[PDB]
């Protein structure tokens, strides 16, 4: 499977050729930011709730960046749902809705960034990445908007025009692409339950589960919805994710310290 055999296939076959695909799969695997953790701060679940939810998490981020390199992505939330309702009602396609949702995740990132600015932590947009801030002990964190950049080229869902890949997917794909060590979704429930804990006074807490098990149990608790769960199964670098309740004081700090708060969802 040398460079030479791969280079020959790359020159002489379609990229769709199973032989070329197999040869490429044998390439070395460089992790771009292996010591970073990607965290998603929920839009509807956290930022839309204002100071009571956001201030403690800002304190956590500030404390945490002393020991942990963080890429902090934002969700979109209620304003995106509003935009999606208006646009879907007009018959607009998923690619148009996708651009609308990006704007809301960007507003949320701007708000979070303004609370973090005096701590040195920037909002970044091209390379979410941002190599300089991530490398400084004084900094060691950056904020980015969580929507993927697909815009008009968003893949539609099988049914309906709501973009399937939203901010959970965007943050997950960044963690995966940069080869980050950990992916933590910060929302407003303790983790995954056997049912939606807001609409059921009976759901059972699940500390750990695989994507296959979630599908087999026919789980509909969409604390993380399926498109990101399918991405997780295909991932090269990030093979599990953790979902934690950002509303609980210190939960983020504890998850970064290796405590098994919330739900760990594994690819297999």
């Amino acid at each position: 499977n040398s460079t030479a055999e791969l280079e020959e296939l790359l020159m002489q076959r379609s990229l769709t050729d199973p032989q070329l695909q197999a040869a490429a799969a044998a390439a070395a695997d460089f992790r771009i930011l292996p010591d970073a953790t990607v965290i998603k701060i929920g839009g509807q679940s956290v930022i839309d709730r204002g100071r009571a939810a956001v201030y403690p998490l800002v304190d956590e981020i500030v404390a945490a960046r002393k020991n942990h390199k963080l890429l902090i992505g934002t969700g979109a939330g209620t304003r995106a749902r509003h935009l999606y309702s208006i646009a879907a009602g007009l018959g607009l396609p998923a690619g148009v809705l996708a651009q609308l949702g990006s704007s809301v995740a960007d507003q949320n990132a701007a708000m979070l960034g303004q609370l973090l600015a005096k701590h040195g932590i920037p909002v970044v947009g091209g390379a979410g990445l941002s190599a300089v801030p991530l490398s400084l002990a004084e900094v060691n964190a950056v904020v980015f908007s969580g929507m993927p950049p697909y815009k008009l080229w968003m893949r539609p869902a099988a049914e309906g025009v709501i973009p399937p890949y939203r901010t959970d997917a965007g943050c997950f794909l960044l963690a995966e692409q940069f080869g980050c060590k950990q992916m933590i979704f910060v929302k407003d429930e303790d983790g995954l339950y056997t049912a939606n804990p807001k609409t059921s006074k009976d759901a059972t807490f699940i500390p750990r589960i695989s994507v296959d098990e979630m599908k087999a149990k026919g789980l509909h608790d969409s604390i993380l919805e399926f498109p990101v769960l399918d991405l997780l199964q295909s991932a090269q670098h990030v093979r599990e994710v953790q979902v934690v309740n950002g509303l609980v004081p210190g939960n983020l700090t504890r998850a970064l310290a290796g405590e098994h708060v919330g739900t760990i969802i594994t690819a297999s």
């Binding site: 460079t3 396609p93 940069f178 090269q236």
Partner: protein, 246 residues
């Protein structure tokens, strides 16, 4: 089927394979002359693929161990370069290359200003490309289809360096047993293993498509095929997407 509205129902989208561009002047000059003659007949978004230079950048990137999200924008850049080359050849007809944000947001005004514009067929997935293969899956055929279908365009024609789809690579080891497919469906293609002249992801986005019912793959090395295809004449391989009319 309660489907989304068509944004630009009058638009014809034409994807030009990067391996057609890689043939240089011998292929590009006749193609430019054919495009020139098409400008008064259709309102065209011409989108270019990447071709061999993307293979080279993949060879280097994979040798450096880079992930699929790193390789995606690097291949996209090659498709952009091909679009800049093609647009230069059509500049005297009023055609320019437009970048992704302009295609996404301002195509209608640009096609009001002039009869055709050129852009990149690769979609802006970039570091958010999906994992699984070390080769970026959402390439030029896929991006051009996503756009064509999102716009509700009147068509998408894929202009290749071969007559259409065969049962094996007609330039490959099994070239001898390659039979031409005048017509196929995306679902039939998706359940075959083996190489195709179109991205596999194109078949997946055809499955969720809302408007484009057929895409024709035609040989842009044969003058007149692109013209015929844009009038609906069957001159290469028709791919049925599985969209049905409302």
């Amino acid at each position: 089927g309660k489907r989304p509205i068509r944004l630009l129902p009058w638009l014809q989208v034409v994807k030009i394979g990067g391996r057609v561009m890689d043939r240089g002047a011998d292929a590009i000059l006749p193609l430019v002359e054919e495009l020139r003659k098409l400008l008064p007949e259709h309102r065209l978004l011409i989108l270019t693929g990447a071709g061999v230079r993307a293979r080279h950048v993949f060879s280097v990137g994979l040798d450096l161990g880079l992930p699929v999200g790193s390789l995606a924008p690097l291949a996209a850049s090659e498709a952009g370069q091909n679009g800049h080359i093609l647009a230069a050849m059509l500049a005297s007809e009023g055609v320019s290359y437009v970048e992704h944000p302009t295609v996404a947001d301002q195509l209608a005004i640009h096609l009001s200003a002039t009869r055709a514009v050129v852009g990149s067929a690769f979609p802006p997935y970039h570091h958010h490309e999906f994992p699984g293969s070390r080769i970026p899956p959402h390439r030029a055929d896929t991006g051009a289809f996503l756009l064509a279908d999102a716009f509700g365009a009147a068509g998408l024609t894929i202009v290749e360096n071969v007559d259409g789809i065969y049962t094996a690579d007609p330039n490959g080891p099994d070239r001898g047993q390659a039979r031409f497919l005048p017509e196929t469906s995306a679902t039939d293609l998706a359940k075959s293993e083996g190489p195709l002249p179109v991205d596999r992801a194109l078949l997946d986005v055809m499955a969720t498509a809302r408007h484009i019912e057929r895409v024709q793959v035609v040989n842009g090395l044969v003058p007149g095929r692109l013209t015929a295809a844009l009038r609906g004449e069957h001159v290469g391989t028709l791919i049925r997407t599985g969209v049905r009319p409302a």
